[model samples]
Target chain A: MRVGLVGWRGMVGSVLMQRMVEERDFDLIEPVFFSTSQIGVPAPNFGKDAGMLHDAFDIESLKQLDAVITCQGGSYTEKVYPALRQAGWKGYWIDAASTLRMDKEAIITLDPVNLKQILHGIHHGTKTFVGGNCTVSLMLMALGGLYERGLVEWMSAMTYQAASGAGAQNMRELISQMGVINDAVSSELANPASSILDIDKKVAETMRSGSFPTDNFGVPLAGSLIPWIDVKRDNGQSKEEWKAGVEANKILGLQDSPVPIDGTCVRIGAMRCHSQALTIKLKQNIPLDEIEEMIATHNDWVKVIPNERDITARELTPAKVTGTLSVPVGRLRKMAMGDDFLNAFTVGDQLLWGAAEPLRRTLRIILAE
Target chain B: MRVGLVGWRGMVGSVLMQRMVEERDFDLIEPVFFSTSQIGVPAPNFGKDAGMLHDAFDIESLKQLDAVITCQGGSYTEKVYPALRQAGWKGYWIDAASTLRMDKEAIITLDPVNLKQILHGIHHGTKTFVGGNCTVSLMLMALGGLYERGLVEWMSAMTYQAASGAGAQNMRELISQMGVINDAVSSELANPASSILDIDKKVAETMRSGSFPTDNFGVPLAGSLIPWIDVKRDNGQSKEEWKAGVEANKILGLQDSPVPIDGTCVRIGAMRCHSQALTIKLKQNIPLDEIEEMIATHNDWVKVIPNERDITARELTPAKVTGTLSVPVGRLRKMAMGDDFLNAFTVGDQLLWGAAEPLRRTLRIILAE
Candidate 1:
């Protein structure tokens, strides 16, 4: 298999490369690195002399590959995909972009949640594969078992998404934003006797002032959060929120009979992990322990933290889950609203299952053919 | 009117004093400052000599006051409240503690939302008045218009609560926690070309390390969020989550016929203001324009941020709401879940409307008598 990889230097692309190298996936294939900007740059040293990169815009070069995985972005996917397919390329086009995700011919690939759909699509000459939304992919990975059992009637996800979901620069901006806010009032924050209102007033002013960093987010993200994420749509949901149902149902092969999944996606200061507070309406009033067991046994990557204080404080956090593949979902219990209603919180490395791991895993699935 | 003020040096108490002084509430009262730890200290200067602080534990000394408000804490309330009332001290008692919020004789005081009930209580000799839950008070302040119109049937609040919601020390600890984590990775973060995973790996490790400060939160809250707040309960709702229903209903004086309210309360890195993502199940399907008008016209403090990128980006944030009394509720649009369901996000100064504003306002209400 000759796999052409593009967007190797980006945030998501870098993580995908790291995972691929750790699994020695590069050893199984003839690697062809592609780039739009750094065309002549040396390909990543994956225990081999890969040589210089190829121009990503050259459909002539990209057409000859057995399969190509591009984390380049949606803009590139929108331009190159149609041309490569039209130029007599029969190769599998695996993308990390959302460009062709909802196309009639494309499948949103998430292995653990919808392995059967991915495999069936591969066998049915479905050449275009796209990764699901970062939040949706992580949610499905954590709660795939309930969805498999038809227990989920509808879900409302109130998200605490990380800075990385916006961009790498956004992550840097968040850190710098915190730095600016913290240093601006270091004197007051250091004094325990100082009026907190005085300190808070200064911090608020600092955030609104022109001195605050807004290069990427256009707003401060430290000591605060943006209640909205992504572009606003006509229906009052952001485009990011709109994808919760469309992409999840498409991955489950239930787009026509979709389980209603709506949410407010917020950008918080967490570096890379995305956390969600979920209110799931169930088809039946299942016991709490049974629901816990269902989610725990769903996948290998997910582990259920007991709804106890000490364990939840230690384990159920983005700080604990960021560098690893583990997805910790806890604080699970029934809501007072209805017997059939359940509340759960989940945190996972958005860079892993959300973006990179699924793309690498999907590539491996098709390579098995 | 002779008024006793306890716990004025504490966080919520400090905010209350600031608001009272700003509104000149002390001008109407002969203010007597009480202290358990600093009995001999001078009270806050309100352009008058407060003299030496009185002993808060002295029930006999407190009996001379016309009304008393205590922000000391729940433990102080548990010990001193019964003794003061048992000594036949026939005076109005307003509390910032949750110890007596649910008592049958106590009315949860929130002015704009339940002014009628509070006035009714004052005239009927309801001496035991308690402020509502901080989150609930802030929530009602933002959305009281909808609750007043009887448009709501149920509500699910997924909260992004601030560090101060835990305590004053927690706010300092969050800043300290971020400082420790940031300083550890100061080298890598300064370079944009550095791998975010590399930086994230160091951050994850630093959080779990023994050196990370957890004196207040018992966990690092800088780059991550805690999914649960308050004490764990038998019904799987944290005591914080349980308060949403119990307190909101009590404030509205509708305990028997309650509008079912439930939510997951998660603590984020925001310093003071608490943010909530609300999913409202309405009794009837209200149009988006009408719903916006209903909430906007409901209060002086709440100004609706239009569901757009630039305006929401400028307003509707914890940073923007931290030191102010404004309750900015935006992202108001109907969810795709159902026509009868609406989605809204709100932010408020937890220290203001959540705690001090209502307590001071309740004092002014009683002082009018």
Candidate 2:
């Protein structure tokens, strides 16, 4: 099976290539690299022969592939997907954007959460399957255990997301700004006793001034966080927050569950993984030990860290969980609101469970069929 | 009135001295500085002439003072308060420790929330008036607007607390560790395009190593956060989390109000101010406009920032709010969970409103009486 890989030089696309090679998926599906900017350049090949990157596929070129996996932005998907379908390309179209997610014919697939639905769509000859948003997909990976068990009646989440979600350039921007902030205060930090107040005051001024570059995130995000993400909508939810609710329900097959989930999504200074603090209200008062067991046994990728004195969000943070496929959940306990109230923290590699890995795994399901 | 000031050289004590001078509270009450470590050193006089720091007051010496204000630890209060009372020191005692907060004869004072109750205690010869925990005092200062109006039936909070809440040394430790982490990754952050992954890997390695100094905080807090604060209680809540709920009720005089509150309290890398994300379930569905008006008009110390695109948690952060007494609340919006639910973000100076200003203002009330 020959697969056309669009945006092959991009961040998420790079991760997909590495994962496909590591999982030996490339043995089943040969990849043809496509790029908009790096055409005529040598594209990376994980243990395979180096392939020269080619310009993005025309309809005639796309028609010959068995599958086309795209990590391009939504606008690219919007422009190309309609053309592919109209030109009679029957290839499987698996996307990492929100563009075709809610289309009448396309399905938003997270294999662990909706494998049966995805397989059913493929068996019935559906052509497109798009991945959910990063925060939504990461949340499902961590807490989908409870959602699958129907134990979670409702959930409230607050995300401490990383810069990598915006792609490779934005991630570099975060690191660059951290360097600037650190350099500005290096002398003051060395002698904190006498200069502590002066250093802190200067740090505050620098952050408030927004003096750093903003081309990527459109705001300064070093040593500070922005409480809003995506574009703001009329319903008072950011587009990211709004889409998480809709997409989670679509993936979980709970479009009409009536058990609502909502919370704030903020971008922090981390580089890769996204961390979330969750307050979940169960349908019944399940014991704490029982809940832990449920999550541990729910999936192979879900890891439950038992409550301990030294293990905290610090140890289970994005910095710790980055570069890993496992979603780590810890600090599970009861809230004072009620016996049914539970609080937990989760961290996941957004590029893996949140973005690229979902498309890679879904392609495997189709290849199996 | 002669007032004995204990722990006059400490962090909160230094802030109290500055606030007393700014508010001219020192004019009505003459201060006698006491310190165990710096007994013979020159002590700050604020507006008056500098005086020699004297040893902590013995029981006989305590009998002569008209009032005493202490920021010493709980053990010191427990050891000295009983001795002072047995020696017939009937002067008023205003403390910043938790030792006397739950004592039968003591009242936790936060004038905006329960002024009448505090005055009643004063008139009835209550000897001790203690300040609440730093996070609790900061949260109440920001959200008490609703609690005072009976608009908030229940609240769940997640705090991004500052290093200063632990003490001056902890704040210093955070800065010191930041310097170490920055130094370790300085070169990698310089060229983030090719070295970005290497830099991130080094950061995670450094964080997981816990190789930096941990003298005051018992952990590294630079570019990372700890999800636990204070000691853990038997019910699984950190002492900080437990104290916030208990003290908020004590301040509101709402032991039987049935409005239970609980949430996670995390320590971030900020030096002074503490910020929180709150999800409030109101007794009724209140308009967002009305909630903003209620907060703006509830107290002069609470600042309501109307939601705007440019304004965010970055602008209203701990570094920005560290020196100010006002608690700034922003990003206020209606949540999708329910019509009666609302979400907001807040930041306040842990040293000012969270500690010293409360002691300063309460002392003014007593002196005026």
Candidate 3:
């Protein structure tokens, strides 16, 4: 299979390239690195160096490939996906970008469980598919196996997401601001130019002084929880907040299920992994041991850490569980309102289950199976 | 009236001394500082230089006082209250600290509203009166007048409480650590000595590590949200969490009201002040304009910031509303479920409205009014 990749310089793009090469799942896969303005220039290597690389995002050339994977997101996905699909390409075009994921017509799948469905889509001439919402993908991968058993009815979740889920630039911004915060605090003046603390304090002071800072990203997010993530649309819920429902509805194949989901996207000072603290309502009375066994026996990509010692959700945080592909779940217990409700916790790299890996797995299942 | 303060050198005791002299409320009152050591020596001028004054917490002198307000808390409150009451002093005894706030027999008052209840207790020969929970005391002051008008039934609060709420020593530790986070980040050093960020980080790291840090005061509380405040018992609820319900029930006189009030107390990076993000469920449905009028005409201490013109809950944060004796409610709107749920916000100095002022107000209502 000839493989073409876009946005190789980005966080997800870079990770996708490395995994594709390291895993060696497919043979004779053509490597094409796509970019926007820095056309014909050497790709800025992320995580691993791919040596010299194809640098143009020419959609015309891109349409000739057997398959193309895009992680550039935003306008690029909106443009490239439809353009390539229109260019008479028979190869699968799997995307981890936002542009097409929520579309009703797109086949959004996280394979193994969604494998047969994805294969059916591919056999029926649908070469394009998109990854679900990062939290949705993570949540499904974490809960998909158990959910299939008819246990989880309703869920209320608070997602602590990282900026990396936005893009590679976001990861750069986080680490860079750490450096900025580091540099400023060392000086005689308390307010350093680059430190997020100084920046937040300055912005907070300005707001107190009756003025908005109105800078690029108004809030410096190095050490504080932003509380608000993504823009809250006129409908009152944030795009990220509303995306969970859209993603969950499609992925669970329960578009008309009476159960609903909502989220509060908390922006904590973490780089890659997204953590979720959840309160789940069970469809029926299930013992802790049974639910624990169900979650443990459910997904290979998920680990239900022992809750014997009253472990908390923070125990499975991103910093500790980073690098590994497994989504970590801890602090599982029955709710206080007696037998009907259960509380569970889990964390996953937004870019992995939500973005890069889901698409990678989806493609892997489509071609291999 | 001869006044002797036990536990004089402690944090709350020290603050109480400063407040006593600064406020000029207790005239015809003799202030005596007590200490366990150096029984014959002059009382140490711990807060400021007041010359060599009377020393010792000799319980023998307890018989000479007309009244005593003890800010010394914990085992100290348990020990001191008995000692003072046993010395043939029939005067009113007010305990500002814990160990008694949750006492079944103690009358916990929050002033003008609850103070009359305290006087009734005093007339009935009840000697000890406890202060209401800090958040509840502050919450009531913000919505006291409105409660009588039958507006609020349930309160959903996210409190960004000050370090001082944990006590004075904790405040110093938090500030020191916060400065350290600034220092470590600014210097670009791999590690720094210690900081509020460090303490908070260590606590979070320890939790993530599946072990609690044993070193500092009780829990690690620098940069993170120390969720469980005032100790947790066997019932899976922290004392702080339970305090809200008790105080609310007492304030509302709804011992049998079917409604419930819930809260999450988070210790943020602030030195003082508890910022509460409140979501209330009104017993009766009302228009937005009616709720606005209820907030404005209801409470003097509550400053209902204009929200229609873009003022939001996030806008009226802790740093913005600090030092103001008002619960700045913004982002008043209907919940997604129905018009039954009303959303708003509030902030206050946990030590100010929650502790000190409630104690001060209680005394004034008893002595002056």
Candidate 4:
């Protein structure tokens, strides 16, 4: 059960490598790394960031690997997977990029949400298991739990996504820029006389530079709500918005849930957190308290909080939830919109459970011969 | 026109004093300090932090001013207002507090959203003018614009509210506790040898400290969403939730809006921002581009941000809008939700337009003599 890794030096790639090493579940695993950089001098010591090291690059002699998990650029998945699969590679290919999920036969997988469908895909000789879209996968996890209980009739969402979803470079860019912004904010406090009038410019430059500050950052992501996430296609629906529909379809196995979803994706300054404000029109009037209990203990990853006992008032921030897989939901109740609808909200580590971890988990599920 | 200032040391009070002085509109202004401890002390500078100052305790000295504007604690408004009017301070009374606004006869006002109604109330002898519920003021700013053009039929909104809506103390509490959890996170990075084998002390500290450092203190307000704002009432609606609906009706002057207005208010960690994800069901199916324009240029304060130029992408967090009157709407679009619905989203500074600026504007309008 040899394994191959792609986008090995990137952010999610780095995390993926770290988790795999930490988990150490599979036997006969050999993660052969690939690089477009002059055909790889070395695997770029991605392990150096975590203060650990293991193995190196071996691209040309790729053979007999039981499974290949890719976090590489979309091009690699688009151009490389089919070619590789057509060759003698008989193992399952799992990709986290958007390159292959659009295919009708591909299994866009997220467990618990689409377990049966994923298992069927696994059985149907489909060698490739594409990661579910982040926003959609996330919505499905909660929606799957609720839809099963008939709590959701129609749903609407607005996503406050972090920049890291665009990939590691944007994450680095935001983080670096934030460092300078934080510095300016501090310096201004220390030297009140030389206060910068153009606070926004100072903040914006820091954000663009990448330290990507929260208020804790002079370019604080703390005080802002940015709506544009990743790409806004010309056809009106953003890449993020479209995911809610497609991912729900794959996850719910509804293929046609008719459970209408409307979304507005925002890219706030948080490095990788995804915050969702959601309203679900319920089928019938249910106890707001009852539904709250449903959300509080919805899943191992989901935690419901009350108004006084809220997570933000209590637990973690985007900076706080950076690596965990749990999705924390609080402030759940029936809105004043009368008794027929339920208004609920959730925040998750977009890069982790919402985007990266789920994809990584799906790969491990299918590719673990 | 001489003016009386109450709650001069609180955030809203200080902001009012600053705006009045900087704008230079008040003539023959008294600027009576409303501190509890420094009630008759000469007014300190208005822009400085209030925790450092002593607040006024009495209401009688307010009689000398021609117009009295109160942004005091709730109990004080309930206790002082009836007496102030009795003492022949026929000076127009403007309030940013909720005490009088909740009363039947007093006018709760958010000028642009319901200026005509307020004018009508003024003609009929209402003693106080107030900013209506924050979410209502915000949602209706766009709602009115759409209703005028006949684009809105029924609407549902999910609001992300800041902690400052509770007050500055809550603001400090949320941030300080979040800082602790953030530190805990940072601690984990060093000392691979150190483990959080037991966190009973930290947990207790987080929950019972001067209000934060508790179960929910470190929660991420910047990028997270909590669906519940105020405590839930017996009818399953929260105080904030009920306020939004009832307030929207009052502000819209809806003799018969025919369309239903449903709203959910969730508290987030931002110091003072309100973000709404709105799905509007139109009586008639209108083109989305037109809806976008209606929201964008809806009013002087309402900035309709195109879906392509989404708000979350802009880093306009709740704290950014904390003291300004602008209501920023982003992710404006026609939803794929129901047959007759279109959706748009909005974010605003709760303290400014929703709380203080409206009181300031009301004073500006009332003292035009």
**DockQ of each model against the real complex?**
0.71, 0.43, 0.17, 0.27
Candidate 1: C-alpha RMSD to true structure equals 1.5
DockQ ranking from best candidate downward: 1, 2, 4, 3
How close to the true structure is residue A326 of candidate 4, measured as C-alpha lDDT? 68
Ten-residue region with minimum lDDT total, candidate 1 chain A: A176-185
lDDT tens digits by residue: candidate 4, A159-207 = 6666567654444334333234345444342342332223333543443
Record all residue pairs in model 1 with backbone atoms less than 3 Å apart, i.e. clashing: none
- TM-score between predicted and true chain B, model 2: 0.95
Total residue pair clashes for candidate 4? 59
TM-score of 1: 0.98
Tell me the tens digit of each residue's lDDT in model 3 across B195-282: 3222323323433342432134343343334334555545444566567776767665666762355544555445456656555667
The regions of model 1 sitting more than 4 angstroms off are none
- Give the number of the best model, judged by lDDT: 1
Candidate 1, A152-266: lDDT as tens digits: 9999999999998988878877777777777767877878778776777777788889978888988888888987788888887889999999998998888779999997999
What's every prediction's RMSD, in angstroms? Answer: 1.5, 2.4, 6.4, 6.3
Model 3: lDDT to the true structure: 0.59
lDDT of 1 by residue, B139-206 (tens): 99889989988789999999999999888888888877777777777788788578776776777788
True contacts kept of each: 0.68, 0.25, 0.01, 0.32
For model 2, the superposed segments whose C-alpha errors exceed 4 Å read: A192-195, A209-220, B188-192, B213-220, B313-315
* Clashes in predicted model 1: 0
Could you tell which candidate, 1 or 4, scores higher by DockQ? 1
Better of 1 and 3 by TM-score: 1
